[PDB]
């Protein structure tokens, strides 16, 4: 089952996360391979505070969107790219932008954006409670291995995340999101 740590919240744990995102807060989410950090990808202030709180990053953020239709609004998506997005492998796919429509600080001065689709039940549930794309960056200060255990995340990400979505299933082997692309007629994994 899920747990919500941070400030008090009456609702079910997904609804709480939706509320926190809506308010421009950083949420640390326990997924399949570890923790990730999320904000509203249309909220410049929230993206700015995450940039400040990591402070040693600079790297562009990946963004999670609800479906292919939503991606086609922000990015150019060829059929092979759509196959990579929809794949059960569920990676981040690096895609060419279609005009600046996201918040500043996501992927500035770059013509590409890393987009992923939902991959765990928690994301599908989160998507029906929000109507904006979300940053989904690794759950780490700087660039070390992402956190995997609840107590490890609560300590390491204390100065980054405002709230946490935890669960009581151990991740045994931490594993990051894949990052791939399509170019020159073949998949090119990063």
């Amino acid at each position: 089952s899920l747990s919500f740590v941070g400030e008090g919240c009456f609702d079910d744990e997904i609804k709480c996360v939706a509320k926190a995102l809506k308010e421009g807060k950083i949420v640390a989410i326990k997924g399949i391979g570890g923790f990730h950090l999320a904000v509203n990808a249309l909220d410049d202030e929230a993206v700015a505070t995450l940039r400040r709180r990591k402070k040693r990053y600079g790297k562009p953020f990946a963004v999670m969107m609800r479906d292919v239709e939503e991606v086609k609004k922000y990015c150019i998506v060829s059929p092979e790219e759509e196959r990579l997005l929809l794949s059960q492998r569920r990676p981040i796919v690096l895609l060419k932008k279609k005009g600046e429509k996201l918040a500043k600080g996501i992927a500035d001065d770059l013509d590409t954006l890393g987009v992923m689709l939902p991959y765990a039940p928690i994301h599908y549930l989160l998507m029906e409670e929000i109507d904006f794309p979300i940053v989904m960056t690794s759950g780490n200060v700087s660039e070390e291995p992402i956190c995997k255990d609840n107590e490890e995340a609560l300590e390491k990400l204390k100065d980054i995340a405002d709230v946490f979505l935890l669960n009581n299933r151990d991740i045994v082997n931490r594993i990051d999101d894949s990052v791939t692309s399509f170019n020159a007629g073949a998949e090119r994994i990063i």
């Binding site: 402070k55 040693r56 200060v141 700087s142 070390e144 100065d159």
Partner: protein
């Protein structure tokens, strides 16, 4: 690739050598060290080869928790080396021994053909006597111990670099050459709580920490914000992309202590003329790794010189 020290370690293999201490401990209470001094230029801001030859061996002879007392001085001199430069070197040696409260009791002088040595080399050996409950060794660090440095890092290294390679800086940099046996004497008030003492010479602070790690079988974590360094050294290194952790020091000691005695060790240093810039800089880890933390908690391994 000076794997000469490997040939050395194979042939003179014994308990004393395997230990890789700053000084051998003989009969249980007396200590013995030796060092050669080949610095160019012979006269540099803040010192010369003479002051260096004494201080370095006085220091090495104390690093075991000891009062240094007696020194030997060996001189290897080029035919036609200016005698007025020699009088200056010898004078500097006399002055340093006097300040250290030490005496040069034996020696040697050899003169070699012109071109068989660049001007002058000096070797010094030292004898010291251990304080009552001294137990200082590079093997003595345990996890939980605190690491201190007696003052700013990288002075000597950058000073001779600047003079030798004619590098002009916005601020002139002086060498830190000093005898530290007085400072060590005040530290040895703490007895067994003082675990490790080493001067970060060839290879700087980085190399010492690795030597502590290897021999104690531990790791060490240091803190960027806590590292003392003169602004002149900071920007000199920042201009050339150098890590001051790799530059040599000649008036500094790295100290490892018991957790509860760290505050006392800092104040003992801060109340001594060569210890005003002392800082607690790190902690002895469980990890067999040498790591440095930046502001906010970004860990990375310290690279070896």
């Amino acid at each position: 690739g000076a794997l000469i020290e490997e040939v050395f370690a194979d042939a003179f293999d014994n308990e004393y050598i395997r230990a890789m201490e700053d000084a051998a401990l003989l009969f249980g209470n007396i200590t013995l060290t030796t060092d050669s001094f080949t610095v160019k230029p012979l006269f540099f801001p803040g010192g010369d080869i003479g002051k260096l030859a004494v201080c370095g061996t006085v220091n090495d002879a104390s690093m075991r928790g000891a009062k240094p007392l007696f020194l030997t001085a060996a001189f290897i001199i080029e035919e036609g080396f200016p005698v007025e430069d020699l009088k200056k070197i010898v004078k500097s040696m006399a002055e340093a021994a006097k300040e250290a409260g030490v005496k040069i009791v034996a020696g040697d002088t050899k003169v070699v053909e012109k071109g068989s040595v660049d001007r002058i080399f000096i070797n010094t050996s030292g004898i010291g006597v251990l304080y009552e409950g001294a137990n200082v060794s590079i093997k003595n660090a345990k996890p939980g111990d605190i690491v201190l440095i007696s003052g700013t890092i990288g002075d000597h290294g950058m000073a001779v670099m600047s003079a030798r390679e004619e590098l002009q800086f916005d601020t002139p940099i002086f060498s830190d050459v000093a005898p530290l046996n007085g400072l060590i004497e005040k530290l040895m008030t703490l007895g067994e709580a003082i675990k490790v003492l080493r001067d970060p010479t060839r290879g700087g602070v980085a190399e010492v920490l690795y030597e502590i790690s290897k021999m104690s079988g531990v790791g060490i974590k240091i803190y960027e914000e806590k590292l003392p360094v003169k602004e002149s050294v900071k920007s000199a290194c920042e201009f050339m992309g150098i890590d001051f952790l790799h530059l040599a020091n000649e008036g500094k000691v790295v100290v490892v202590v018991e957790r509860d005695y760290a505050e006392k060790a800092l104040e003992i240093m801060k109340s001594h003329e060569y210890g005003k810039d002392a800082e607690i800089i790190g902690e002895v880890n469980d990890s067999k790794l040498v790591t440095i933390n930046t502001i906010y908690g970004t860990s990375r391994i310290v690279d070896r010189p």
